[PDB]
């Protein structure tokens, strides 16, 4: 065992990257400002008025062009790629892939019966190919944050494709800058950058999108009512999910929505992650035995770092380590198979905190 | 403006069906014992020996026979019926309907093209039919508690049924008495006698139906992920789910749970239940303007009781005089169209409360 000196960690050790770090004062407003509102009906008007404060809050975040709307409905974004397959996609989707959830998605949809065959786009971990579109399809899918691999991709809409823009943003939305407008649903989970809890999906989606969810239910295909996008819009335009939510996640994600606007927004929130993953990568840039597993500056993501470690520094026992003192949750993405660690970055994580967890690392590996 | 005078009120105005109740020591467990899980992953150990701790408890609880098993996953009840048609259902389903939740399972069940064609017996609300079955079907479902009208059936499995029983137990479980061998699956969601948020489903299943879940699987049948029984069961077991839960709603459950089992268990919150009911139906029959709109005393749910009110006092006055007073959700379910209030009786409700709200009631309408 060795016992890493007080004086050069972080004062919070959780690097996870979802779930993820909950602020101390965050936190506390589930037994004080909150409290109240726990145990009490999704049908009245105090829970709807919380519902109402994550939707407007989101649109100011977001900065939503006339006609977008806050959906969300329970599940985590896993159940919105089962909604998706069912309510946005009329035809056939693209969908590039480059990790475990951007890959996970295009499996959804290739098994799903009710859509055809859709084309795959892949390029290795680590990379990702670029946006693009094709003649027959209806929807373009990729990931903003590729959580497994620490990739960013630029969210742009693609020429030619005047196909709906479908963004698994679950780690990117409200870390990453983003122009909606070049997005027709961009969705997430509130357990990453918004620093609550899973079992909730959201979804900003454009007046295109929410015509195409209404079309499609017109045809008459079937979609199980809990994965049903009509009934989560008709649901979510009246501040209410269709069937009963988690009020912590509501609490805890409306406070965070309110610290990022009450710190000046995306544009803080998306410095934020810059100041703390320019910690990481350049102290992985600067240790012989480090290297960002991402080798394109470009798509090096601010909010999940992905550091491989060389042959000669075991990373497994590194996070162990780590763990055993308090910094926790650094583990590679269970399925990638690296000697690597993965460190999240997302707003609540402090700055100095990264810079210290490098020191931290530096200190346990000179004693390996 | 009518003030109730402090003296006559309850000490917690919660008398919601679900979300309901949740206690302020419960809740404060959030803050303190349970704050280091909150953003720290539920692929590690300190988050799945929360799950541990759920399922355990749950075992204790509901006195499981052997081979019977907890498995979990997020979406809430209304998840688990889309979920259970693809998965449990082989050919066909008999259904008992009688209000809201029990109708609403038989049409997912009706809609979904992987099943066949269910039989739907039905009763008036305020009633139920009998358990009961008919040899073209492989599994027969009812509620346990039909949280719409305040019926509640026995759990017991038919003769001639040797069919899988499955339960929806939403607003039952935890509050009144059951014999876990005469189900196969016994499901649920936190947010009525558990005290805790929703977004999550349990369900208690036997050997008998997790053999038909494999069974199932084997044949090939598409379900989306999200939907998987066989995952969900594949995951529960090792203390997970297949995406990303919501700590909080884990963390409230769990201490609900062990809050019931050293109070007595089972028996202890089924005694509960009755003294608060027993205060409730008493008073109803008492005063000359109201009346319990369930006339069979067998049927008369001891944890939501629904009253209703002769022509000339208006419950819907009544019920936005207490919520105006902190007094809430005593309003019926919002779809039955009744002269009604619906008062939850769940064992975190205290029966001294119950009886405050009745001289409340009598309060408010001596002075209408
Ligand atoms: C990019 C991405 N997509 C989808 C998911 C699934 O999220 P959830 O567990 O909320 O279903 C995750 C994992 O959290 C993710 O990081
Ligand atoms: C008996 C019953 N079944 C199903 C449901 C659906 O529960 P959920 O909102 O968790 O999907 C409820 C409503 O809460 C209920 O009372």
Same mark, same amino acid.
């Given at each position: 065992?060795?016992?890493?000196?007080?004086?050069?960690?972080?004062r919070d050790?959780?690097?996870?990257?979802?779930p993820?770090?909950?602020?101390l004062?965050?936190?506390?407003?589930?037994?004080?400002?909150?409290?109240?509102?726990?145990?009490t009906?999704?049908?009245?008007?105090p829970?709807?008025?919380?519902?109402?404060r994550?939707?407007?809050?989101?649109?100011?975040?977001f900065s939503?062009?006339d006609?977008?709307?806050?959906i969300?409905?329970?599940?985590?974004?896993?159940?919105?790629?089962?909604?998706?397959?069912?309510?946005?996609?009329?035809?056939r989707?693209?969908?590039?892939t480059?990790g475990?959830?951007?890959a996970?998605?295009?499996?959804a949809?290739?098994?799903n019966?009710?859509?055809?065959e859709?084309?795959?786009?892949?390029?290795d971990?680590?990379?990702?190919?670029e946006p693009?579109?094709?003649?027959?399809?209806?929807?373009?899918?990729?990931?903003?944050?590729?959580?497994?691999? @620490?990739?960013?991709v $630029? =969210?742009? #809409?693609?020429?030619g +494709?005047?196909a709906?823009?479908?963004i698994? !943003?679950?780690?990117?939305?409200?870390g990453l800058?983003?122009?909606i407008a070049?997005?027709?649903?961009?969705?997430?989970?509130?357990?990453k950058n918004?620093a609550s809890?899973?079992?909730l999906?959201?979804?900003?989606?454009?007046?295109?999108?929410?015509?195409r969810?209404?079309?499609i239910?017109?045809t008459?295909?079937?979609?199980?009512?809990?994965?049903?996008?009509?009934?989560?819009?008709?649901n979510?335009?009246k501040?209410?999910?269709?069937?009963?939510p988690?009020?912590?996640?509501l609490?805890?994600?409306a406070?965070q929505?309110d610290?990022?606007?009450?710190?000046? @927004?995306?544009?803080? $929130? =998306?410095? #934020?992650?810059?100041? +703390?993953?320019?910690r990481?990568?350049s102290? !992985?840039?600067?240790r012989?035995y480090?290297?960002?597993?991402?080798t394109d500056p470009?798509?090096?993501?601010?909010v999940?770092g992905?550091?491989?470690?060389?042959?000669?520094?075991?990373a497994?026992?590194?996070?162990?380590?780590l763990?055993?003192?308090?910094?926790?949750?650094?583990e590679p993405?269970?399925?990638?198979?690296?000697?690597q660690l993965?460190?999240?970055?997302?707003?609540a994580?402090?700055?100095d905190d990264?810079?210290?967890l490098?020191?931290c690392?530096?200190?346990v590996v000179?004693?390996?």
């Amino acid at each position: 065992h060795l016992e890493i000196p007080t004086a050069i960690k972080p004062r919070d050790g959780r690097f996870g990257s979802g779930p993820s770090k909950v602020r101390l004062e965050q936190l506390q407003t589930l037994t004080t400002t909150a409290a109240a509102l726990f145990g009490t009906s999704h049908r009245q008007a105090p829970v709807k008025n919380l519902v109402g404060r994550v939707r407007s809050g989101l649109a100011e975040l977001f900065s939503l062009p006339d006609g977008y709307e806050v959906i969300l409905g329970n599940g985590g974004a896993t159940a919105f790629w089962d909604a998706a397959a069912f309510g946005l996609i009329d035809k056939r989707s693209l969908h590039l892939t480059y990790g475990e959830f951007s890959a996970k998605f295009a499996s959804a949809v290739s098994k799903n019966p009710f859509v055809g065959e859709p084309i795959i786009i892949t390029s290795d971990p680590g990379s990702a190919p670029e946006p693009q579109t094709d003649p027959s399809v209806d929807v373009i899918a990729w990931a903003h944050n590729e959580t497994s691999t @620490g990739v960013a991709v $630029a =969210v742009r #809409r693609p020429e030619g +494709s005047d196909a709906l823009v479908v963004i698994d !943003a679950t780690s990117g939305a409200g870390g990453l800058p983003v122009d909606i407008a070049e997005t027709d649903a961009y969705y997430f989970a509130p357990q990453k950058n918004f620093a609550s809890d899973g079992g909730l999906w959201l979804a900003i989606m454009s007046p295109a999108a929410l015509s195409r969810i209404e079309a499609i239910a017109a045809t008459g295909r079937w979609v199980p009512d809990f994965l049903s996008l009509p009934i989560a819009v008709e649901n979510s335009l009246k501040n209410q999910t269709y069937n009963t939510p988690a009020i912590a996640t509501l609490a805890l994600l409306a406070e965070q929505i309110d610290w990022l606007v009450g710190n000046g @927004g995306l544009d803080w $929130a =998306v410095k #934020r992650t810059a100041d +703390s993953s320019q910690r990481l990568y350049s102290w !992985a840039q600067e240790r012989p035995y480090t290297t960002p597993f991402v080798t394109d500056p470009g798509l090096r993501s601010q909010v999940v770092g992905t550091i491989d470690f060389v042959d000669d520094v075991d990373a497994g026992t590194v996070a162990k380590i780590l763990r055993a003192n308090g910094i926790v949750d650094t583990e590679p993405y269970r399925k990638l198979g690296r000697n690597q660690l993965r460190v999240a970055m997302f707003p609540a994580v402090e700055p100095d905190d990264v810079s210290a967890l490098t020191e931290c690392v530096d200190w346990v590996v000179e004693r390996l």
